[PDB]
Design a protein around this ligand. Structure first.
Ligand SMILES: CC(=O)N[C@H]1[C@H](O[C@@H]2[C@H](O[C@]3(C(=O)O)C[C@H](O)[C@@H](NC(C)=O)[C@H]([C@H](O)[C@H](O)CO)O3)[C@@H](O)[C@H](O[C@H]3[C@H](O)[C@@H](O)[C@H](O)O[C@@H]3CO)O[C@@H]2CO)O[C@H](CO)[C@H](O)[C@@H]1O[C@@H]1O[C@H](CO)[C@H](O)[C@H](O)[C@H]1O
Ligand SMILES: CC(=O)N[C@H]1[C@H](O[C@@H]2[C@H](O[C@]3(C(=O)O)C[C@H](O)[C@@H](NC(C)=O)[C@H]([C@H](O)[C@H](O)CO)O3)[C@@H](O)[C@H](O[C@H]3[C@H](O)[C@@H](O)[C@H](O)O[C@@H]3CO)O[C@@H]2CO)O[C@H](CO)[C@H](O)[C@@H]1O[C@@H]1O[C@H](CO)[C@H](O)[C@H](O)[C@H]1O
Ligand SMILES: CC(=O)N[C@H]1[C@H](O[C@@H]2[C@H](O[C@]3(C(=O)O)C[C@H](O)[C@@H](NC(C)=O)[C@H]([C@H](O)[C@H](O)CO)O3)[C@@H](O)[C@H](O)O[C@@H]2CO)O[C@H](CO)[C@H](O)[C@@H]1O
Ligand SMILES: CC(=O)N[C@H]1[C@H](O[C@@H]2[C@H](O[C@]3(C(=O)O)C[C@H](O)[C@@H](NC(C)=O)[C@H]([C@H](O)[C@H](O)CO)O3)[C@@H](O)[C@H](O)O[C@@H]2CO)O[C@H](CO)[C@H](O)[C@@H]1O
Ligand code: SIA
Lengths: 271, 271, 262, 268, 274
């Protein structure tokens, strides 16, 4: 896309506000354990590594329809919505201030219930087209067939424990692409901005912040934000805050929702 | 509110100083264990998760009266107090330098008493109206009926383990809204600034700072601070610094007070 | 104070250090720079620390050159913790790692670091984890004469000024944020049981003491007040007995002459 | 090189994009355990310290051919201005169902990949210059004759002995454990590295497509690509996979690079 | 109680010079020909504080060197003289990647099946650049420490309780490599007007080392008045210590491990009063 000047005047700016609920594995809001995974299980061997249905976190994603940019398609320029900035927050951080749930507990069954703790994984992306994904896994043989709604490659190969550029996808479905085997494709995504962090280990303290005062600038080094193809804005995320440890030591992922407030402006482009 | 010019000269500025004491669960300054929760207990099962009275932390909040501005509410323009900045500190951090309290001890009963340690949760908000809340919980079935002075929703539903926008509130009462199930609503709070952090885990070192040299600017991206509706200033916080571990392993939340020094200025608005 | 112009021409520096006040504060006695052995209350009602087991603030007043009126204004300070390298020591008579074959435990655990520079005594607020704490094992301490449950929170009826070195316990006195208009203070706490100390030292960092209006602390009666505490952890003896360990703090304070209205 | 002015006008900029797969020890993409090491073994004594073939991470490196500049007093070189680089597949570490040791008496999660992290990258106009330095001068590398190591051993190599140097000229061959960047050379390369050690330490990782690293030095001059060759090198260890019985393997991840270059005039 | 006249820079050709050097670590076994070089001898532990006598070679010392700079003044009676002024330093810890090694003969994880313990625990990193020897203050965790197993160490000739705090009667200058123990000597903050020093300590038992290395960072040595260390008698003084943890042997015996540090120092000619 050859980017030209900003469009000025009335109705040249718009905002989009949304939230995305977490997709930890139990993704039905009408059922118990919503916002958690099913109980984690562990393979006996790498050739019998078959996660149960619902124990696998996936990306959250939505396409938002922007205000229509009505115009003649036969002229030498067109208009696109350009995402300038986003204010985004993890919602419900305070819910982790809870140590009376039915959990394993400290100090000879007299202390606190274990809080949700351990692995944290936080990412978000805002773009003008679906987030482009690269397949990469810790175990090429993982069998995802317990849940046919998970979108994964139809063939397995040893090389997918590294980067094999023949294994790619686009994030086009909520609650379906496992984070364990799909990551952003850094060779593409020119029209998306993504930001991610991982803090691993076993029982690691979650470290989280929340504020309504932080603006993330989405403009690139040339001053250009994501350009929304077909007036579609794509928002994606995952926010794992740790594991809930049940009385018997069984564990489930816990995720939290994410909020977004995105500012967009009209940008002229060559046609 | 349509914001017009600043009012200048003498009497155009005022400052508000206050502190808020912690609301950990034992919230009566005339009783033992003030500034701590009652002993934490642990649910036998998720459908029998009923915290005892006084074991759960709540938000601290106050509405402060500001000097009356408008004798005549039918003038074409009116004046409002605009909060410009705040200096805020957690008070009594040094009280955590104490390892001789009646606590569990290190090294086969020869070493130090355990200091207050573990989960930290710190947040404050300054606004021109009550802080707007969103309900979100780790357990939709939590039963708050041991303490009818708490403010919680009248109905429970599975979806409240994620973000359900039908479950909202406003922080209108000190020591009554549980931290564990209410968080700031990021879709509202246009007239409040809030800042929060959480560090979890079991016995995690508290990491705390105190200084009288830091000013937090409350002006938004347009140079406008919170506007105090009805000449009321709203201040809210929570500061959990960890758990006290009793000799038998029984644990209590410990909180600390927070100090605020808020600078406000007169702003003309259209009426 | 009604502040007017700076005097040009007019600057001086003050250099000092403060030794640590961990509990055994006599420089000629064994265990100097450490507390006495920590003891643990049988119950909150019986909580009476032994003499010398609790850290206190270090403080001094420096007499400045005698001078509308002219006052000394503290502009900046270079401050650093002394002797950090002394913590590189794992052969002391301590508990040790790996089945009595590995290193002695280094000094580790709780860290608490604060300093203040002002033109008058640091103003303190009382706040304690246990209102019942009995300080009568050491009558050289300065604590309130009466006890009340409300002191586990902020009760503004319980205040003092930091006028005596090695006497105000850090466990029950903190900087009063509602006062101290003429002092700058800075503090940090890292807790837990055996936490690694994380410390830095350099002679290259200047801390500006000027407030948001460009005015530093103004030295009333030509007195400059410096206060601090630097707890770097616990020494763990062979049998598990523990003692606080503290280190000295150095200060180099730049002052200038300020005219004020009288 | 006598550095003169930047070349102006159209065609004066180019970009190079690539990725490098990790070299943890099993470096064959057709075989199981690709992107991990072979099982770690432990010496019985310092004079019997002979790592098995494939248990040793090595540097990843490539030389990239740039567009030819000079068909014939001054000449033109490509100058590397900046790089955007990221570790790929961080999300693959959100996996606790692999065949691993477990938490909480075989009821809890499988251990994630955790422990030692080592991350470095280098971009230069010639091979990365290396200094030998090892924890054990007696390490015997003879189980794998494809590893590039010095021809003799000496006690002094547990510190810095400047008689023990090399250049990073082969992918998957120079062990990380005994070769580091030579800080006395590398005038024409920029390198950045970090190490977080310990036993089971949480990995702390970030990934974004928004960060540009400037490669210009204090005089405004980036790496100058001798013979129209760009050199890229890295290593990204993200921890260990802990097998059911306690057996452990290094895990590494690939790294992506997008490098911006410009034409710079220099003297013949 | 409480309590060189610098003129202009010399401009033009030959007014700048650079000094490049490295210092090898002094952990206790400081003989580059012997096994255990770059490590201490095995750590031992006192039975009591009055019997705290470290073995020879178990304690780390400062590395240091004086570098001879080009001689500037053929006539020392001139009304002004020239001195080398240290403007900046690029410094790096060398060999960080050597810590990516878990097959050495060490204690190991997971019931003798897992990795050998990497070098881990206490980290101590400091460097100093100045125009005269680093000025030292004695301060110790134990005033009674007996250093007589190694008479090549430089320590005070008498002991006193007060040395567990700051006793300013116990000072020294860092004039010998591999001889001043870091456990009892630190920079004297009341002096060192003509040296810049930077240090950090991360303690604990088995703490992860957190280390960085790059050739892209310049540390400015100029003070607040724009003046760097001035090299008295044309000598540049460089000092450091870089402890990266302990190696844990099979039986639990432990040794300090240190790494070398590299320096590239830029200096310029400065005129001074005489
Ligand atoms: C649900 C259950 O009963 N699990 C027991 C398990 O049964 C095996 C299969 O279950 C899973 C699982 O635990 O859910 C299936 C997962 O996909 C596997 N996970 C991965 C990553 O590959 C895991 C995993 O392999 C094991 O947990 C590791 O030991 O196993 C289960 O679906 C299967 O059921 C058979 C059924 O028995 C048969 O009659 C019918 O015709 O076909 C079904 C489908 O094949 O049986 C599998 C065993 O043959 O077996 C293990 C021991 O092997 C445990 O008994 C496990 O019970 C739980 O174990 C927990 C700890 O892991 C904990 O102790 C819980 O309290 C147990 O309920
Ligand atoms: C695979 C095995 O059974 N190893 C046992 C080992 O055998 C020695 C050689 O194995 C290695 C290895 O484990 O792979 C080779 C490595 O280069 C060594 N690593 C380092 C850093 O030096 C390791 C290491 O020394 C040990 O693991 C430490 O215990 O050993 C093995 O290749 C060699 O094979 C001989 C063969 O036996 C002989 O008939 C033939 O003619 O020559 C072959 C090649 O020389 O035999 C070596 C011993 O002579 O021996 C040790 C005892 O020294 C153990 O028994 C080891 O078993 C593992 O032990 C682990 C704990 O140490 C753990 O329990 C594993 O599960 C065991 O397999
Ligand atoms: C009041 C009483 O007899 N308590 C004993 C307790 O009985 C439990 C249960 O009591 C409670 C309690 O008040 O301690 C009720 C609480 O709702 C519940 N907490 C939560 C978060 O659900 C706690 C908690 O489960 C336990 O204290 C464990 O931490 O229990 C009472 O209502 C029920 O009828 O009987 C229960 C025992 O079967 O039991 C504990 C031992 O677990 C003690 O003996 C209490 O004194
Ligand atoms: C050489 C020897 O006899 N070693 C045995 C030791 O005897 C000790 C003591 O020896 C030393 C030693 O060299 O290891 C002397 C050191 O000054 C001292 N270290 C410190 C910091 O004071 C160490 C240390 O106390 C121990 O090694 C424990 O780590 O001991 C020797 O001089 C004296 O006559 O007897 C002492 C105890 O009987 O004892 C250890 C067991 O603790 C071993 O048996 C050594 O082989
Ligand atoms: C904080 C506190 O109350 N300490 C008290 C201790 C401890 O209870 C025990 O020593 C267990 O450490 O008991 C004393 O007899 C003592 O040892 O001097 C009295 C002292 O007042």
């Amino acid at each position: 896309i050859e980017v030209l000047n900003l469009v000025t005047g009335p109705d040249s700016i718009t905002t989009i506000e949304l939230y995305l609920n977490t997709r930890m594995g139990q993704n039905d809001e009408s059922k118990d354990n919503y916002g958690y995974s099913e109980k984690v299980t562990v393979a006996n061997s790498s050739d019998q590594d078959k996660p149960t249905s619902g124990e696998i976190p996936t990306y959250s994603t939505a396409r938002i329809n922007l205000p229509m940019l009505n115009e003649d398609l036969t002229c030498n320029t067109l208009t696109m919505w350009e995402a300038v900035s986003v204010k985004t927050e993890v919602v419900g951080v305070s819910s982790l201030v809870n140590v009376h749930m039915a959990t394993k507990r400290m100090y000879d069954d007299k202390g606190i219930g274990f809080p949700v703790e351990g692995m944290n994984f936080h990412m978000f992306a805002v773009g003008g087209e679906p987030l482009e994904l690269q397949f990469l896994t810790g175990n090429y043989r993982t069998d995802y067939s317990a849940n046919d709604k998970l979108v994964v490659p139809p063939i397995k190969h040893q090389s997918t424990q590294g980067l094999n550029p023949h294994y790619k996808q686009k994030l086009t479905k909520d609650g379906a692409f496992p984070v364990e085997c799909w990551c952003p494709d850094p060779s593409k995504n020119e029209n998306t901005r993504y930001y991610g962090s991982y803090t691993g280990g076993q029982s690691t303290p979650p470290v989280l912040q929340f504020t309504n005062t932080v603006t993330t600038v989405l403009l690139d080094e040339n001053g250009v934000g994501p350009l929304c193809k077909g007036d579609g804005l794509y928002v994606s995320c995952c926010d794992i805050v740790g594991f809930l440890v049940g009385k018997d030591g069984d564990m489930q992922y816990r995720g939290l929702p994410r909020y977004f407030n995105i500012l967009l402006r009209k940008r002229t482009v060559r046609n």
